Amino acid sequence: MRLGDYKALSFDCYGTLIDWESGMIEGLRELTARVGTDMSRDEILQAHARHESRQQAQTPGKPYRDLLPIVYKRLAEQWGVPFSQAECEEYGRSVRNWPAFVDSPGALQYLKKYYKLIILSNVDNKTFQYSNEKLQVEFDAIYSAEDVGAYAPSDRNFEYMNGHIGDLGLEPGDILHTAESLFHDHVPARKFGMANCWIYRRHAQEGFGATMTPSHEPTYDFRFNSMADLVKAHQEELRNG
Structure with a gap:
């Protein structure tokens, strides 16, 4: 003890x-702004937790920097907003x-x-x-x-x-x-x-x-x-x- x-x-x-909560909020802010600033920090973080954990189980050998671009896509699609593959890859680079x-x-x-x-x-x-x-x-x-x-x-x-x-x-x-x-x-x-x-x-x-x-x-x-x-x-x- x-x-x-x-x-x-x-x-x-x-x-x-x-x-990482502050870091991912900053990395996601162009995307979440398309949804609206009424969406709270906790809602964003929990939506990310859901897609990140599920994708980590789906593709366990995918490097994190290449997995987060998929999470970004899943979030953008769930929120119904336009996005680009370039934005997805940039988000995976944001961890650094x-x-x-x-x-x-x-x-x-x-x-x-x-x-x-x-x-x-x-x-x-x-x-x-x-x-x-x-x-x-x-x-x-x-x-x-x-x-x-x-x-x-x-x-x-x-x-x-x-x-x-x-x-x-x-x-x-x-x-x-x-x-x-x-x-x-x-x-x-x-x-x-x-x-x-x-x-x-x-x-x-x-x-x-x-x-x-x-x-x-x-x-x-x-x-x-x-x-x-x-x-x-x-x-x-x-x-x-």
């Missing part, structure tokens, strides 16, 4: 470290510009001093390098959907990570999986018997945003509203332990 009991943290990226949460770089730099840092992310490797540059830290391992050939919450993603962490000198019990998404991360993490830390980025925001409603709310061993609060809790453990 202590953060210091773990040798490594594994992180989801998009939603936990990178603010999705911004970090402002607390993520400093938090990751702090945590690097105490833990090996692992990424488990629904992304392609070419795209992720740009997010990695925004995060300003070296990851001990990056396990991407491209490496896996499937997208979380597929069993294959945790299985792939578990099959490689031995190369880092780690076993599954050494790792605290740290993530925002109940659907993508915490349901599978609990299925795999992982210890888990919920970074509840949407603590003040109604609904699930860009993640799907999970089949159930899974258990979590730790919860914090931000990466900055995770770091403060680690500092508190060292100060008072």
Whole structure:
């Protein structure tokens, strides 16, 4: 029950470290403006969650940068608005510009001093390098959907990570999986018997945003509203332990 009991943290990226909700809102705004500005942020995010999760199941080996153009098309068609294939492909390129949460770089730099840092992310490797540059830290391992050939919450993603962490000198019990998404991360993490830390980025925001409603709310061993609060809790453990 202590953060210091773990040798490594594994992180989801998009939603936990990178603010993908703000990033996709910006990437979609020319399209959503054709619908109308009355359509709310939550409606946009949930419509994207629906098409993204379904397309990730349909074509699990498609690189994320090539999958999001299809999601853009599905949304435009659902909303009945004109669009172009060029706009679709540009949207898939927009991921590299999705911004970090402002607390993520400093938090990751702090945590690097105490833990090996692992990424488990629904992304392609070419795209992720740009997010990695925004995060300003070296990851001990990056396990991407491209490496896996499937997208979380597929069993294959945790299985792939578990099959490689031995190369880092780690076993599954050494790792605290740290993530925002109940659907993508915490349901599978609990299925795999992982210890888990919920970074509840949407603590003040109604609904699930860009993640799907999970089949159930899974258990979590730790919860914090931000990466900055995770770091403060680690500092508190060292100060008072």
